[PDB]
Amino acid sequence: PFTVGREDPRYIELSHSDNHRFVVEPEEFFLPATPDDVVASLQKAVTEGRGVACRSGGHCGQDFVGTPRRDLVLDLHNLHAIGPAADGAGVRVGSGATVDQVQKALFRRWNAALPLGACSAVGMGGLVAGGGYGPLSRQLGLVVDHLHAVEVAVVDESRTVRLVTARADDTGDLGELFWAHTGGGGGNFGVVTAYEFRSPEHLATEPVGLPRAAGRLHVQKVVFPWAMIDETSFVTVMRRFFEWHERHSEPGSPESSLFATFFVNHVSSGVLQLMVQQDADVDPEGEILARFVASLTEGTGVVGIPRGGVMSWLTGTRYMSQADCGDVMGARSASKSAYHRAAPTDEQLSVLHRHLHADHPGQASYVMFNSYGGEINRRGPSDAAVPQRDSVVKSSWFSAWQDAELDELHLGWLRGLYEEFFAGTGGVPVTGGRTDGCYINYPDADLLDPARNRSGEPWHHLYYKDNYARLRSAKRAWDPLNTFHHSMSIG
């Protein structure tokens, strides 16, 4: 239970989150070991008028943790305990636990799985608060759809800090706090010290009331050389990917056992890469997977080089996942998001193609398209703070790089692509049409700027749609002093 000031040599490491474009430089970091430590620390800070913020996994796409300047940053990585829920079924998970830790614990102790993300180093803190989706989401829904309770340290009008727990079944103000944590996003209401999970009745199994991890996964990665792909066949492949998702994204369908990630890389990478996994319990021969993959490229001259097989759950999952190692470490990055309810037009796809061929250093520049929908779309838009309940594909527009001197170049490329792709609707994926806005866990500060966003739609509507009002009430009720704020925090 210690403190790391500017004078301490651990400070330099602590001053970097995953995205190296932003720096976190408080007077001190505090590393708590228990929720009580969190409470005492916050109390000391707010009484003394010091500004605070917390960090779990450090994966934030923006400067939320370290901007504006903080006096105190709580680093939560020691709060990583996983155990049965005190009361009832379910599992309690510390907010400082990473996806990797959670997956391993759930699987090894209970043969259980939650729809956690594909990146093993992401922290539960931000992931859960923002919604959270993953390769299992078409079967299991969003992470917040399994949320039973939240234990969070909040600050009231009299500057008193309290540890409150808010449950799925609570009403009144507690009910609002709980609901606000099912997609409201981190850094808004207080410091979550733990989450409790309990699945919906139709997904729950024993022993702990979570879903069963599949016995086996069909996993497959297919590399397509850019050299074999012209504009026309590119447009065809993309269109088919999207149309397959248009047809096969109902809750409960057989195809909901399948999840694809399409890395549409800038041409300097030499390849497009398709990753697909399917639950082998549902489909022992992986017929659906084979048909999907084959159908993508049938009519074209495009031939992919496949690799993979059938693997046990933990091994297959790690084979498909991104860990905290190699070239994703220490990098500067920028990302944008879009929810798709239907396929992009062919003209949009042509714009994409063109930008993927521009003269640009894009060995780590790409657009990722993920399968979405399925079980996710079972719920109604108002049931959780996350509003998007009828999209079928989710996209992430991404660029990473090393030197600060190249920031403008890379932002330039990303903006150029995104804004042109969505030029028909003011350069953003407006809600209620072919698209349904953006995902708060891929926050994008450009949405605040009229030069970037000409749609008339404010950031809070793209992220929260009609849930914003309720989030605002919850904010007034639970953080009246605006103790927790950042450049895109609830108003």
Both tokens of 398, joined, read 């991404």
- In 3D space, the residue among 194, 236, 199 whose CA is nearest the CA of residue 83 turns out to be 194
Cα separation of 54 and 121, whole Å?
17
64 binds ligand FAD (CB under 6 A): yes
Q: Among residues 24, 39, 42, 53, which is the contact residue for ligand FAD, using CB under 6 A?
A: 53
By the rule CB under 6 A, 133 interacts with ligand FAD:
yes
Q: Show Cβ contacts of residue 169 under 8 Å, excluding neighbours closer than 6 positions.
A: none
Would you say 56 is a known binding-site residue? yes
Q: Is 325 annotated as a binding residue?
A: no
Q: Which does 183 bind (CB under 5 to 8 A by kind): ligand FAD, ligand VGP, a second copy, none?
A: none
Stretch that binds ligand VGP, among 130-138, 161-169, 378-386, 481-489 (CB under 6 A): 130-138
* Cβ-based nearer residue to ligand FAD, 30 or 234: 30
Report the partner that residue 54 touches, choosing among ligand VGP, ligand FAD, a second copy, none (CB closer than 5 to 8 A by kind). ligand FAD
Total site size for ligand VGP, rule CB under 6 A: 19
Question: Would you say 383 and 280 are in contact if contact means Cβ atoms under 8 Å apart?
Answer: no
- Find out whether 59 is annotated in a ligand binding site: yes
Binding mask 261-300 for ligand VGP (x = CB under 6 A): x-------------x-------------------------
Phi, psi of 130 (to 5 degrees): -80, -5
- Would you count residue 333 as binding ligand VGP (CB under 6 A)? yes
Phi, psi values for residue 279, rounded to 5°: -60, 115
Q: Is 473 annotated as a binding residue?
A: no
Q: What's the rounded Cα separation, in Å, for the pair 389 and 374?
A: 10
Interface with ligand VGP includes 418 (CB under 6 A)? no
Q: Which is nearer to ligand FAD, 193 or 435 (CB)?
A: 193
For residues 132 and 344, which CB has a smaller minimum distance to ligand FAD in the complex? 132
Number of residues that bind ligand FAD (CB under 6 A): 35
337 binds ligand FAD (CB under 6 A): no
Closest approach, Cβ 329 to a second copy, in A, equals 4
Rounded CA gap, 132 and 137, in Å? 9
Contact 16, 331 (CB under 8 A): no
Q: CA 458, 464, 465 angle in degrees (round to 5)?
A: 70
- The answer to whether 54 is a known ligand-binding residue is yes
Question: DSSP letters of 21-48?
Answer: TSB---SEEEE-SSHHHHHHHHHHHHHT
Write out the two tokens for 139. 């079967």
Cα dihedral 64, 66, 72, 75 in deg (nearest 10): 70
Q: What are the residues whose beta carbons fall under 8 Å from the beta carbon of 467, sequence distance 6 or more?
A: 183, 381, 382, 385, 386, 387
Site for ligand VGP in 428-447 (CB under 6 A): 442
Q: Does 410 sit near ligand VGP (CB under 6 A)?
A: no
- Give me the 430-469 binding string for ligand FAD, x by CB under 6 A, dash otherwise: -----------x----------------------------
127 contacts which partner out of ligand VGP, a second copy, ligand FAD, none, CB within 5 to 8 A by kind? Answer: ligand FAD
Q: Which of 249, 297, 335, 489 binds ligand VGP (CB under 6 A)?
A: 335
Which stretch in 104-112, 133-141, 206-214, 244-252 sits in contact with ligand VGP by CB under 6 A?
Answer: 133-141
Residue 316 touches which of ligand FAD, ligand VGP, a second copy, none (Cβ within 5-8 Å per kind): a second copy
Which CB sits closer to ligand FAD, 17 or 348? 17
> How far apart are alpha carbons 385 and 465 in whole angstroms?
9
Query: Please, which contacts does 34-41 make with residues 24 or more away whose CB atoms are closer than 8 Å?
Result: 34/1, 34/79, 35/79, 35/151, 35/153, 35/163, 35/193, 35/194, 36/163, 37/1, 38/74, 38/76, 38/79, 38/153, 38/163, 38/191, 38/193, 39/153, 39/161, 39/162, 39/163, 41/72, 41/74
119 counts as binding ligand VGP under rule CB under 6 A: yes
Helix then strand count (H, E) for the chain reads: 13, 16
Distance (Å, whole) CA 127 – CA 94:
12
* Residue 289 binds which entry of ligand VGP, a second copy, ligand FAD, none, CB below 5-8 Å type-dependent: none
Helices 346-357 and 231-247 cross at an angle (nearest 10°) of: 130
What gap in Å lies between CA 86 and CA 240, rounded to an integer?
48
Q: Which residues bind ligand FAD (CB under 6 A)?
A: 17-18, 53-61, 64-65, 76, 95, 117-119, 122-123, 125-127, 129-130, 132-134, 186-187, 191-192, 322, 441, 486
Q: Which residues bind ligand VGP (CB under 6 A)?
A: 59, 61, 117-119, 133-135, 261, 275, 322, 328, 333, 335, 368, 370, 396, 398, 442
Binding-site residue positions for FAD? 54, 56-60, 118-119, 123, 126, 133, 192, 439, 441
